[PDB]
Amino acid sequence: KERERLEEKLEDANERIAELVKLEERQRIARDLEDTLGQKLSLIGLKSDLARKLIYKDPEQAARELKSVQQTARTSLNEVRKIVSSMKIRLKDELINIKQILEAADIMFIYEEEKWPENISLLNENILSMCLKEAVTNVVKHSQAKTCRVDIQQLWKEVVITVSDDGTFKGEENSFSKGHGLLGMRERLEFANGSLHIDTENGTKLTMAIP
């Protein structure tokens, strides 16, 4: 009846982790909104007040300011749908989308369909997807690969997706773009007590694990 106390303190902690990362989500999200979006909207107000001043005397230019308000409302709307999506992907869907990305990059898509996992949640599933997006985006974008092999495997407690490629690695200890592509991926695996692994030994072999 002491080891069970150990379980009450440790559980307190395994709930705490959950809340203080849901907060990662929160703050980062209000950051995007606040910044990108709100700045766009301020811009819209100012350019439309300006065009409103121009109407009578410089109309040719009021219409230009207004072409600009038009486009900033556009871009703001795209930013919104971008968020929304960063909140709404499908696994078997990402498979098709990257299938197209590489097919298009003139890269060979080796996928040997296996056992589609059962022990996976949908926060987990969506994270997995994302890491798919950035791993393939990075392969296409950099590797120099001519082949990419994607293994989705139910394995034990967790799904594992390895994304391998033959190309050469362009990465130096800076490359790890502080809070960007691969760092986003890997911190994002570390939080859900999964993990990201990379073996540059033979081209570049990526590896994602998630309960």
Added chain:
Amino acid sequence: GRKERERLEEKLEDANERIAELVKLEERQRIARDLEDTLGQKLSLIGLKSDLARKLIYKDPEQAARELKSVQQTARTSLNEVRKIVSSMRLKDELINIKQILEAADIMFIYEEEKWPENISLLNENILSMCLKEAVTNVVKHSQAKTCRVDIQQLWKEVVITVSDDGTFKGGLLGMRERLEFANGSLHIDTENGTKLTMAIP
């Protein structure tokens, strides 16, 4: 036992995963809903009214400027909407804000400061706050009360905030209560003597 009894534990850790994924899902779904709807609709509006004003410039300028007063205000309103959402993204703070709400409604604020709890998280704390907002908003707004008493109590596993008032019951609150039910806390209301609200949270 340990092996068979053990595996159930799993049946429960994981049963529990399945459960709290519904807070993520339909927290982010309320959020994408608000964005999508309110905001995106506003932005479409902006595009259309500015394309229109752009057509008017030359022939009907007096009215291009009117459409444009409109684009101006819709950018405003859109920005405020973004605000609501960033803000949603403090307990002792809510205390001051409602202190003002009721003080202003000509309602008496009985608060007898107690033991500020320790066993509380901040998802919990912020939920508590919110329910404060809607309970007091509802009291001011409806009760007919002339007094409101707020008890914040560390109690056992969980903080408990009762918001009582003398007024009559005329029966927001579903948001409050489902939102307590999810964090295995609870909402209780006793209309027996005016209206007495009660929130509990681990």
